[PDB]
DNA sequence: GAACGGAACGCCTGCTCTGAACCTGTGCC
DNA sequence: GGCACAGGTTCAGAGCAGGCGTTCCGTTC
């Protein structure tokens, strides 16, 4: 390994190319010593044609290579890449790469590979443009893989000049009845720490999908949130429920409707998880004056069924706050506010009615009947 | 119906050239028959229809006849010259109609005018382009038309 | 410094040499003009000089009609039959393109606000002086490359800018009542001097017709097809928006302007010789 | 985790230096939640009453306020028939006024403050908030009878 | 009838709970806006809040029109008095924060705001926009949705600015006529300056803009006047914007110089002489920053065999 | 009064403008 | 006759502007 590393100081100029051939001879003959060979070939003096040859002679045996060595391998591929050898290597690269195959040390170097690919594609627009032009030219096959998704999210997360072009390509791809559940399930179940890296870009893309028409687009804007919430840690869960509460308090009805359905989905899904952030679901009651009775029936239903998950009756806190704000809104003179109360009251009565619970609904329906007489 | 016509190629048979030239002349006589109704039926909505669909039909003639005409000219010249001089007689009535939407300073009419005039002058100079492609650009004559009312007067 | 005495006696000297001497070296003639223009632009707007040049062109190259006697050597001596044709034609036109862009951003900004009265007056003086320019080139018998086609395309822009001026006076006159005598005079002058000479010149070039890769040949002629249609379109929308002004300011400016000159084609008996 | 580090100073601080008329100990029934006793505010109808409260500490406490109810029945404008408290520092910003500059004692002090001074502008009970205001003695009679049947011994 | 000037805010608080029509809200808000001149600075913020909880159920255009024209006027007062900041800037910041928090609950206002602040034709921008409205926009940048539109908006707003300039020098004609109206060049610079009173919502958009400019109109023409000069003058702004956010904002200048070399290094597909001369004046003022940012400098030597002679040399 | 034909704002695309290179005419030794 | 400047021309490609689609409102019988 050291001799290899020292060969550039040793050899005279007549005997570069010679050594070149017989090093490619050693390359096929032993894998372990891929790295220093490569480093050597790139610190030799050679003819570029030969370097194309050996680079293909990398690429063919790239399934056989232990992962640890891949980064500097693929760094080499993407410094040996020309402007003209772009799609060639990238299509081949994009095919041969697996990232299903590799999987505790595996996951760490996968992450470090992605760091290295980030730095590559971050660092030459040459790749980004052509990379995309190579994923759009895979709109043909329904079968384009986890890498193509994760890679898109990545170029949107890093590369800025392209943001419209990624969104354009993703929208013309997603409408077409390409990327669907099955892809996202596998992506977010396997590559979840690579994606917890890029938390921003995920939720940035989910928000940009909620603002379009076409239930297919907005369905994906939903699902992107869904999988981030299901899978990611408590930090990113809080940030997820954050963007949805931003839509409810803030947006126009489409956004509001969407986000309400999503919270409704996530709570029947995992009551316990939303329980942590259920304070931010109550934080919508600030701006009840910006939201319509339809949406109010659904909101009081979602909060009320969160509370009437049976195991979370230790955390009656939200339930008692809502009971409180009910009697408060009922006890307003103004018909607009009494109406909000009445809706919430009857929804809550209904969900908790599915002997003390009988007395509870009795009291609530009697007091709404009495305020409303 | 006329916009669903495809222009052919020079490689395509003379039979299909003549059947499409026949189908074009059927549409150009149906168009002159429809235009000739204007004089006896002068009203707001009927003028709005013909100013509008005049130029919209002129455009079907610009896209799906004029490519068939550069192919089938050295073979079927007389057919095509007849088809074009048939359109010229109602061409002149659309120029006179443009006269009427000007003199009756009528805004509802004068909307589709600037495009009518431009779309018509496109078809004039597209004929010059046809003669250029058939190597006789020296044969394109042009000359002005007498400003009539719809019926045929000399409004002066 | 543009207003320095030494700048002004420099501009004066340049003008004098351009006005006296001939010099049949081409780019030399071009250059003492380019100088003179770049000197003049910083001192005052350049329409007086453009009208003088269009009048020398009218004198030198003749006319469409084949029977008008004109000769106006006296204005600028570095303008020849040899010079002026692909030379001082281009120069005078390019200086108008700019002058018209100056005036059109002015109008654009005036329409923003809703100070005004001196703004419209100077706009109109410019437009009227360079109309004496456009009229004197439109009379002339001009060579038929982009020399004529640049004039055509700039006469499109002439009318566009007037269409916009019109649409601004629509915003004013509906509220108050005006179209001051300078604007009525302008629309009359566009009818009497320019619009019918458009139709005389369009027909003069169109009729005027004096080895070719098929695609490039079609691209050449389908480039040449657009500018005459869009001159018709531009004048039609001028006249059209003069209708809207006529109705909603209670003065028919359609009294000054004529009914639209309309065209029918022919094909002659030469097709039978060639095919 | 933070729950432990707050509760550690607080349990210890409520055994060693609780506020006047107030105690709070780790409940003998419930060795996770806190039992308080707030003794009826002086010159209020709650005089001679010992008012039991359950203080529920949330999980992300001290980022969330404590969750307190009157377990002794209380006849009060800002307290309903189930012991629910109209309190700003029981909710988070902007509706409420909890933040980490506060603690279980400062709020239990603010609770004895509300027992003495009901707020008629946050009524849970409109009958009692009205009675408190318009027939003070009928409120004070009913709340003192309340204190004799439920807060007595 | 005239309203009690001490209690105009307080009377406006009663209208909040009663229902009004469109003409009713128009009249209540336009009198409350007539009242802005004849009052002290620091009661304006809660009054603006009181106007806006009303404006959400009717007239919203009027609110922003008024606030913006009013503070434009008052900012003009400061500038011509300079030819009174340490109260003005604080109240301005608080008002910008209030209207951003309102846009956070009513995105429509957002959209009506942008529509109001449109360039459109080149004359409208010259009376629409201000050092305050820019301040406002670059603050709105904070909310994910309008980042894009706002930045494009400012961006083209910016170029127009230069087209206006260039044109007006060239000829004698236009100079006469037009009185030289504030260019969005000088307006934004004053915005950067007055973030010192430390409005730190603002700054992210300023960095964002300065870079975008250096991105879009880099010399790739050089690897006339019309395609060269108004596209020198976009990044030469970019440069001054980022030079001043670095020389004023001490917190930021880590991400600023991170993002500069991000673009200097692995690129050299499109040239970067303008970035090099930014980098130069960044580090020359205060190299001391560079010692927290060595991480990038260690991985710049990484690729210091694939970068060409002139990137590396400098 | 009511039925018809024109005005209003968000989306897509064709037209235009540009600039860069190659090539074919033509100018001079 | 041969070579090189000149200008024509031809194409990539960026960016702009207007006409349509879905929806409301003035006008004429």
Topology:
This is part of a larger assembly, with 2 copies of chain A, 2 copies of chain C and 1 copy of chain D (153 residues).
Chain A (H helix, E strand, L loop, with lengths): L1 H9 L5 H14 L5 H8 L5 H12 L10 H8 L8 H11 L8 H18 L2 H12 L9 H13 L4 H13 L5 H10 L1 H6 L1 H12 L4 H17 L2 H17 L2 H17 L1 H6 L1 H5 L10 H15 L9 H14 L4 H19 L2 H16 L2
Helix pairs in contact in A: 1-3, 5-7, 6-8, 9-11, 9-13, 11-14, 13-14, 14-15, 14-16, 15-16, 16-19, 19-21, 20-21, 21-22
Chain C lengths: L4 H16 L5 H16 L6 H14 L19 H4 L3 H26 L3 H23 L6 H28 L7 H27 L6 H11 L2 H21 L15 E5 L3 H4 L1
Helix pairs in contact in C: 1-2, 3-5, 3-6, 5-6, 5-7, 6-7, 6-8, 7-10
Chain D lengths: L1 H15 L5 E5 L7 E6 L10 E7 L10 E4 L33 H13 L9 H9 L1 H14 L4
Antiparallel strand pairs in D: 1-2, 2-3, 3-4
Chain B binds a DNA duplex (29 and 29 nucleotides) through α2.
Characterize the structure shown.
This is part of a larger assembly, with 2 copies of chain A, 2 copies of chain C and 1 copy of chain D (153 residues). Chain A has helices at 2-10, 16-29, 35-42, 48-59, 70-77, 86-96, 105-122, 125-136, 146-158, 163-175, 181-190, 192-197, 199-210, 215-231, 234-250, 253-269, 271-276, 278-282, 293-307, 317-330, 335-353, 356-371. Chain A is an all-alpha fold. In chain A, helix 9 packs across helix 11 (181-190), helix 16 packs parallel to helix 19 (293-307) and helix 19 packs parallel to helix 21 (335-353). With 275 residues, chain C is mainly α. Chain C has helices spanning 5-20, 26-41, 48-61, 81-84, 88-113, 117-139, 146-173, 181-207, 214-224, 227-247, 271-274, and one strand spanning 263-267. The longest helix of chain C is centred in the middle third of the chain and has 28 residues, at 146-173. By secondary structure, chain D is an alpha+beta fold. Chain D is 33% helix and 14% strand. In chain D, helix 3 packs across helix 4. Chains in contact: A-D, A-E, B-C, C-E. Chains B and C meet through helix 4, helix 6 and strand 1 of B and helix 8, helix 9, helix 10 and strand 1 of C. Chain B binds a DNA duplex (29 and 29 nucleotides) through helix 2. Chain E: This is Fanconi anemia, complementation group I.
């Amino acid at each position: 390994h050291d001799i290899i590393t020292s060969l550039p100081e040793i050899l005279g100029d007549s005997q570069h190319a010679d050594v070149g051939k017989e090093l490619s001879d050693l390359l096929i003959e032993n894998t372990s010593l891929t790295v220093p060979i490569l480093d050597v070939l790139s610190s030799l003096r050679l003819d570029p044609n030969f370097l194309l040859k050996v680079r293909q002679l990398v690429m063919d045996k790239l399934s056989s290579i232990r992962l640890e060595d891949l980064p500097v391998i693929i760094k080499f591929i993407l410094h040996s890449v020309t402007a003209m050898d772009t799609l060639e290597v990238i299509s081949e690269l994009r095919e041969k790469l697996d990232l299903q195959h590799c999987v505790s040390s595996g996951q760490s170097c996968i992450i470090l590979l992605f760091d290295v690919i980030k730095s590559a594609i971050r660092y030459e627009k040459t790749i980004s443009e052509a990379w995309i032009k190579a994923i759009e030219n895979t709109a043909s096959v329904s079968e384009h893989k986890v890498f193509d998704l994760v890679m898109l999210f990545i170029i949107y997360s890093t590369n800025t000049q392209t943001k419209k072009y990624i969104d354009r390509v993703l929208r013309n791809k997603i409408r077409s009845g390409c990327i669907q559940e099955q892809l996202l399930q596998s992506t977010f179940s396997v590559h979840y720490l690579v994606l917890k890296d890029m938390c921003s870009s995920i939720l940035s893309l989910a928000q940009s999908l909620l603002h379009s028409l076409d239930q297919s687009i907005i369905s994906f804007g939903s699902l992107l949130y869904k999988y981030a919430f299901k899978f990611f840690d408590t930090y990113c869960q809080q940030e997820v429920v954050g963007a949805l509460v931003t839509h409810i308090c803030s947006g126009n009805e489409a956004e509001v409707d969407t986000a309400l359905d999503v919270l409704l989905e996530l709570v029947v899904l995992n009551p316990s998880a939303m329980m942590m952030n259920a304070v931010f679901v109550k934080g919508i009651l600030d701006y009840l004056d910006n939201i319509s009775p339809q949406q109010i029936r659904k909101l009081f239903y979602v909060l009320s069924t969160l509370a009437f998950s049976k195991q979370n009756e230790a955390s009656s806190h939200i339930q008692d706050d809502m009971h409180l704000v009910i009697r408060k809104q009922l006890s307003s003179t103004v018909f607009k506010y009494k109406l909000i109360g009445i809706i919430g009251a009857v929804t809550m009565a209904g969900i908790m009615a599915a002997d003390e619970q009988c007395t509870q609904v009795t009291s609530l329906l009697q007091l709404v009947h009495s305020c409303s007489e | 119906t006329v916009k669903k016509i495809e222009p052919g190629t020079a490689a395509d048979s003379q039979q299909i050239h003549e059947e499409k030239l026949l189908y074009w002349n059927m549409a150009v006589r149906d168009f002159s028959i429809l235009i000739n109704l204007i004089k006896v039926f002068d009203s707001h909505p009927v003028l709005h229809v013909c100013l509008k669909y005049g130029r919209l039909f002129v455009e079907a003639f610009l896209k799906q006849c004029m490519p068939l005409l550069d192919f089938s000219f050295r073979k079927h010249r007389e057919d095509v010259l007849s088809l074009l001089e048939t359109f010229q007689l109602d061409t002149r009535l659309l120029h006179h109609l443009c006269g009427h939407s000007k003199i009756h300073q009528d805004t509802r009419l004068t909307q589709h005018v600037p495009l009518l005039k431009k779309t018509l002058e496109l078809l004039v100079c597209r004929v010059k382009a046809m003669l250029t492609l058939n190597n006789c650009r020296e044969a394109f004559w042009l000359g002005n038309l007498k400003n009539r009312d719809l019926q045929g007067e000399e409004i002066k | 410094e543009p207003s320095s005495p030494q700048f002004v006696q420099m501009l004066s000297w340049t003008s004098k040499i351009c006005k006296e001497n001939s010099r049949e070296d081409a780019l030399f003639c071009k250059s003492l003009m380019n100088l003179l223009f770049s000197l003049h632009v910083s001192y005052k707007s350049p329409v007086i000089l453009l009208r003088d040049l269009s009048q020398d062109i009218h004198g030198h190259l003749g006319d469409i009609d084949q029977d008008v006697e004109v000769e106006k050597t006296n204005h600028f001596a570095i303008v020849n039959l040899r010079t002026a044709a692909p030379t001082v034609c281009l120069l005078v036109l390019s200086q108008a393109e700019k002058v018209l862009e100056e005036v059109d951003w002015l109008i654009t900004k005036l329409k923003g606000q809703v100070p005004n009265q001196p703004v419209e007056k100077a706009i109109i003086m410019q437009l009227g002086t360079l109309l004496t320019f456009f009229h004197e080139l439109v009379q002339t018998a001009l060579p038929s490359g982009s020399c004529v086609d640049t004039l055509l395309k700039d006469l499109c822009k002439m009318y566009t800018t007037l269409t916009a001026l019109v649409r601004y006076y629509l915003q004013v006159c509906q509220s108050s009542g005006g179209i001051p005598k300078n604007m009525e005079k302008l629309v009359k002058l566009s009818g009497s001097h320019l619009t019918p000479l458009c139709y005389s010149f369009i027909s003069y070039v169109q009729n005027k017709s004096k080895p070719a890769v098929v695609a490039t040949a079609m691209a050449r002629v389908l480039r040449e097809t657009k500018p005459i249609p869009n001159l018709i379109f531009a004048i039609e929308q001028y006249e059209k928006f003069l209708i809207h002004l006529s109705k909603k300011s209670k003065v028919s400016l359609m009294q000054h302007m004529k009914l639209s000159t309309s065209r029918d084609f022919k094909i002659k008996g030469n097709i039978l010789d060639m095919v | 985790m933070q729950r432990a580090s707050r509760l550690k100073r607080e349990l210890h601080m409520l055994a060693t230096e609780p506020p006047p008329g107030i105690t709070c100990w780790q409940d003998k029934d419930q060795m996770d939640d806190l039992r308080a006793q707030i003794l009826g505010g002086a010159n209020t109808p709650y005089e001679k009453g010992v008012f039991k409260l359950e203080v529920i500490i949330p999980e992300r406490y001290p980022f969330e306020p404590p969750q307190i109810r009157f377990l002794t029945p209380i006849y009060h404008p800002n307290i309903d028939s189930a012991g629910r408290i109209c309190l700003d520092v029981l909710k988070l910003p902007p509706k409420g006024a909890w933040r980490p500059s506060l603690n279980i004692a400062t709020v239990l002090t603010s609770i004895q403050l509300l027992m003495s001074e009901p707020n008629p502008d946050d009524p849970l009970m409109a009958d009692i908030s009205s009675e408190f205001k318009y027939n003070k003695p009928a409120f004070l009679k009913n709340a003192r009878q309340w204190t004799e049947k439920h807060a007595r011994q | 009838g005239r309203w009690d000037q001490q209690y105009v805010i307080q009377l406006t608080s009663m209208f909040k709970d009663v229902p009004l029509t469109a003409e009713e809200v128009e009249f209540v808000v336009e009198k409350a806006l007539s009242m802005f001149s004849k009052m002290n600075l620091q009661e304006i913020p809660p009054l603006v809040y009181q106007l806006l909880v009303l404006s959400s159920k009717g007239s919203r255009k009027s609110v922003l029109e008024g606030i913006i024209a009013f503070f434009s006027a008052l900012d003009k007062q400061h500038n011509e008095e300079q030819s009174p900041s340490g109260e003005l800037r604080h109240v301005e910041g608080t008002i910008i924060l209030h209207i951003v928090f309102a846009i956070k609950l009513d995105y429509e206002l957002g959209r009506e705001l942008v529509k109001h602040l449109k360039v459109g034709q080149q004359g409208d921008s010259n009376n629409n926009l201000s050092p305050f409205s820019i301040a406002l926009l670059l603050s709105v940048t904070r909310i994910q949705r309008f980042q894009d539109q706002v930045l494009d908006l400012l961006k083209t707003s910016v170029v127009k600015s230069f087209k206006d300039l260039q044109l007006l020098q060239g000829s004698k004609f236009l100079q006469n006529l037009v009185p030289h109206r504030s260019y969005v060049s000088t307006m934004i610079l004053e915005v950067v300056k007055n973030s010192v009173h430390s409005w730190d919502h603002v700054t992210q958009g300023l960095v964002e803009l300065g870079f975008i400019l250096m991105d879009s109109y880099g010399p790739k023409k050089v690897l006339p006047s019309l395609s060269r000069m108004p596209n020198q003058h976009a990044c030469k702004l970019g440069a001054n914007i980022l030079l001043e956010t670095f020389k004023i904002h001490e917190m930021i200048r880590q991400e600023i110089l991170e993002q500069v070399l991000n673009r200097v290094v692995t690129r050299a597909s499109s040239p970067i002489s303008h970035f090099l001369d930014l980098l130069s004046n960044i580090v020359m003022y205060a190299p001391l920053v560079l010692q927290s940012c060595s991480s990038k400098v260690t991985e710049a030597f990484d690729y210091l065999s694939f970068l060409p002679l002139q990137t590396v040399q400098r």
